Amino acid sequence: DDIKVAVVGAMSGPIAQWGDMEFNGARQAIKDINAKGGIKGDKLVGVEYDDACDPKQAVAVANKIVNDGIKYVIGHLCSSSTQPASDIYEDEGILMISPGATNPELTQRGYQHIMRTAGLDSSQGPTAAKYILETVKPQRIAIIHDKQQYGEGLARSVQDGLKAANANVVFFDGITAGEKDFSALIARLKKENIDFVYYGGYYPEMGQMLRQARSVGLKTQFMGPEGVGNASLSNIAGDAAEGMLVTMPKRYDQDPANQGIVDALKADKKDPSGPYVWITYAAVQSLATALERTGSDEPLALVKDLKANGANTVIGPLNWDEKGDLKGFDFGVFQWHADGSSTKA
Amino acid sequence: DDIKVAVVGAMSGPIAQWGDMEFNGARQAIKDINAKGGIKGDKLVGVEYDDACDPKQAVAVANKIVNDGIKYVIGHLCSSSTQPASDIYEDEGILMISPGATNPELTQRGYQHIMRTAGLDSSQGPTAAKYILETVKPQRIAIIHDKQQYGEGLARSVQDGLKAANANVVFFDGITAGEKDFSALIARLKKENIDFVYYGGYYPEMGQMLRQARSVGLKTQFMGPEGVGNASLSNIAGDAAEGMLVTMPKRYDQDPANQGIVDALKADKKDPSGPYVWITYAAVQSLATALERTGSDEPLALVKDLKANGANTVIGPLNWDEKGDLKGFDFGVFQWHADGSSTKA
Questions:
Q1: Residues 6+ apart with CB under 8 A from B167
Q2: Dist. CA A113–CA A76, nearest whole Å
Q3: CB of A271 within 8 Å of any CB in chain B?
Q4: Which of A15, A219, B56, B139 has its CA 20 to 30 A from that of A262?
Q5: Contacts of A122 in chain B (CB under 8 A)
Q6: Which Cys-Cys disulfides exist here (chains A, B)?
Q7: Do residue A340 and residue B268 have CB atoms under 8 angstroms apart?
């Protein structure tokens, strides 16, 4: 029999541009999987629903999906819609894989029918530690943060990773957001011969730190999370932002293995650059992998199978933890330039 | 004394690009208002908070704002964050004006300290009726929709507007989404000499309708809401999409009166195209108008003043209804072209 898969997101409202990315990625994945034989000859059929990223409509759509007899949902796109809908899908035993990326609590409620293919913002911590250890290979590290949840969380994760690998974290310290005078910190970095700094925080502080570091001839390599990557960074720091490392999502449309999909999209006059194209494509590939590998139609069997075995996707190999979040998923690492551009690795 | 205004949105996480638009618009508005004399000489001071568009962090930020003694909030950006935060601000008598655009229920709970500067998606109905009546001036109208909440809602609003103005709505009908054969509908349009159609629905149906209409030489002008404006429309319809009218948000960065702001933004290497730049700038201008006009510091007095008297902003003159939504706010009207481009009016 045909296998129906609901695809839910914004066809209307303020989030429609991202919704278009989602529906385009799901449609292409379905076509591609069918052209390779479907699920042991059975075709996938996408059934699209617009929830306008509106909670009330999300609930209407979820109830319609239940009534329609559909067992698998790729969606929804926004937190305010995915959250109430997921309550209905969990109660009804319907598999839901979301490509939307906000709200950690979605997967913290013990739901067993829920999964995501968007990596959590916090994943940047282990990803940075990995790059520092495999590629940078610094000798004397300092880790700095601005005492706020975002930056301190990430700096603590980087510290844990680096310490776990026996790296030399010389010191770990917090600074005050809004700080314009980094003279004491930079002088300490120089005296302690620090060759690498990870800064958990935002671009204004990073830019000030970089300007002051270069003003005293520090050769230190700096790195931070996406929050330091801003077009007004190189504005504060000038030439001093050159060479800064930053984690940001990988540009999946640049992966050579994805060029077939990039071409199909461009041929249909669809922009392939949008991250939700790829994240949604990957959710479909994950579902298809589970259906193929298990031979089962039962949602829970599929979720357990993916948690156990993972899937290969257009965003790379994926693995999930027991709560349905991705485990060990990597943002890319980019080198910043004085002109605000950034290149991979 | 300095007047503190909290600005809350995403400096981190998946919504950071829109958050940057928000903080840039608020910062520029604050600078511009101060350069014109502030509030009777008192300077506005923006205090920025990152909620990462995460509900738990939004609540933390709201409680911090309460503790910090701040009376006015421009934020938050996302529904899942603005909703729980607004409960705290309402309880504490803090004014909150959101520039984010999702979720109608925000303003349907009887809260008196809450307002928005983003126009609701449903505003497109009266906006279309207005354009049809003032500019198109058709003689025989038909209104078509696909029986789904989005399209039928909008078609009903257009019908109400046109009927209220004594226009000749010849017929009103629903079609089935997924319909590929519009032969009967188009033949009816031809027989009834229909010169204008409003279609409430999405691009696949509009594209099919347009292709078939032109295949029989219909001269009918078609129009629909933003959901029919898609780069794959002209893909289905080809040359038949030429001349289609569509409502979409106005390009505020193209308004000549806004070029000073566009220049300040570009000078700081900030993209001025983003709608949240303007919507947020306008929220600051609204607050400043109320502070100036009333001479009061009390949040509720400011909200009542704006509801009574409105404000002039970079997104045009604004008025609000008693629930704090914009009243009579207009998206722009655009003419679609065969190549997927669109021009104003």
A1: B132, B133, B138, B141
A2: 14
A3: yes
A4: A15
A5: none
A6: 53-78
A7: no
Distances (CA, A) of B26 to A106, B2, B9, B23, B164: 31, 16, 11, 5, 39
Cβ-contact B303, B289 below 8 angstroms = no
| Claim to verify: residue B82 and residue B146 sit in the same structural domain | no
State how far the Cα of A32 lies from the Cα of A260, in Å rounded to an integer.
Answer: 10
Q: Which of B52, B103, B232 sits opposite A55 (nearest CB)?
A: B103
CATH at residue A19: 3.40.50.2300
Burial (CB < 10 A; 0-12, 13-18, 19+), residue A225, is buried
User: Do A234 and A345 have their domain in common?
Assistant: yes
Helix-helix angle A16-35:A259-267, to 10 degrees: 120
B309 and B178, same structural domain?
no
Are A126 and A242 in a shared domain? yes
Q: CA–CA separation, B255 vs B242, rounded Å? A: 25
Residue range of the domain that includes B162: 121-249+331-345
What is the number of domains present in chain B? 2
Answer whether A223's CB lies under 8 Å from A138's CB: no
User: Entry resolution in angstroms?
Assistant: 1.5
Collapsing DSSP to helix, strand or coil, A10 comes out as coil
Phi and psi for A289 in degrees, rounded to 5? -60, -45
Q: Are residues B260 and B289 in the same domain?
A: yes
Q: Please tell me whether residue A333 adopts helix, strand or coil conformation.
A: strand
Q: Which of A57, A83, A231 is the closest to B149 by Cβ?
A: A57
The CA distance from A292 to A38, in Å, is 9
Query: Do A150 and A235 belong together in one domain?
Result: yes
State whether residue A44 is helix, strand or coil.
Answer: strand
What distance, in Å, lies between the first and last C-alpha atoms of chain A?
A: 46
φ, ψ dihedrals at A220, nearest 5°: -50, 135
The answer on A207 and A176 residing in a single domain is: yes
Nearest of A10, A32, A35, A29 to residue A20 by alpha carbon: A10
